[PDB]
Every structure is written in structure tokens, then in C-alpha cells.
Amino acid sequence: AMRIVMGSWWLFTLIVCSSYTANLAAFLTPVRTFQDLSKQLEMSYGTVRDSAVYEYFRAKGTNPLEQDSTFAELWRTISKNGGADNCVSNPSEGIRKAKKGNYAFLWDVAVVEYAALTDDDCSVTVIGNSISSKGYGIALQHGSPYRDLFSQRILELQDTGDLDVLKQKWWPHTGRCDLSFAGVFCILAIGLLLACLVAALELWWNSN
């Protein structure tokens, strides 16, 4: 009769216990940025001031006519104070300052390729970049006739891939480092405690 009424109160308790467990486990989806245009919103980069990586995209920061907007935004993000308190002297300075600051260091791909393998803790991560920024070159004086057969030997082994094969050799590419369930387990030993107390009461009432 009135057995039921107060039992109708332990309802809404557990309604709220349903509800908080329902809600906030959804909201957990801390970095989600994998590219340059992704990592625009991640405050500063870490670079070398007045450098070849700097001045090139400085020059692309003075190109207003195209709507790429990844570049000049981050450039004037770090052009504050005229570049002061945004940058380091050498990339040797930017190692731990990127490791112990808000900076993500920006450099050549192959340097960061080397720098990732040279962490004992391996607490770093490179992200991809496939762009058409520049090339690579080697100077030779005017009147030195070596250029065509040099680049013959370049294009032979690059078209057999062997230059990048040797780059894979002295710099490995497969990665030096690498690159719900609890409650069902939880009820197991609780049930084993149950069967323990069962065999306890079995010898308890065998003795009784």
C-alpha cells in the first residue's frame, strides 16, 4: 500500500544518475590539428627570425591578391613586436623551447626527420606537408660545363628513385619509435567473491 510511495522517491535520484552519466561522456570530443591550416588556431609557431623559412613566407605575407590566408595570418601572428619575442636564434635553441613552450617548430622537412629520431624519450611528432614551395640546387660557376651530365646523373637515379633510397638508408623511414572494457572485468572478481562466500556458507552450514 504505502510500501510503494517512498519507493517512488528513489526513482528520480536514479533518473539524475542516468542523466549525468548519459551527458558528459559524450562531450569529450587536447589537440585536434594535423596540418598547417589546422594548426592556425594553435597560437604561435617556433621559427628563426629573418631566416629563409621566415623571409620567404614574409614575402608571401606581402602577397595580398590571393585568398590562401593560411600564411599571412600566421605571419602577422608572429610579426608582432616586429618579430621580437616570437622566434629563436638557431634551431638548436628551438628544441627545448618547442618542447617547453607553446611553439611548434617550423623548419625543413629533413631536419625534423632527423630531429624526431634523435629523441630518447621520443616525445615528439611530425605532421605531414605536401607543398610546392621551392626545390633544391647546387651552384656551379659560369663556363663550368659540368651541369648537364651532373643533372643527367641526378635524373637517372631519381627516376630510379635511388637518391631517396639512400635517404631511406641513412635516415630510416618506417619509424624508429612507432611511425567499456573495465566493468565487465570488474564484475568477474565480484562474482568470484560471491562464489567464495557461497563455499564459505557451504562449509558454514555443513558445520551447522
Partner: peptide, 19 residues
């Protein structure tokens, strides 16, 4: 001022973040 050999590859910029 000087001549240049041809490309073997192209330059692309790199980004290191922490793991």
C-alpha cells in the same frame, strides 16, 4: 652570378609537434 645544377627533389616545409 653562378649557374645551378638541376633539382633532385623539391623543398617542402616541416612541422614538429610533441607526442
Amino acid at each position: 652570378v653562378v649557374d645551378f645544377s638541376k633539382r633532385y627533389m623539391d623543398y617542402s616545409v616541416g612541422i614538429l609537434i610533441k607526442k
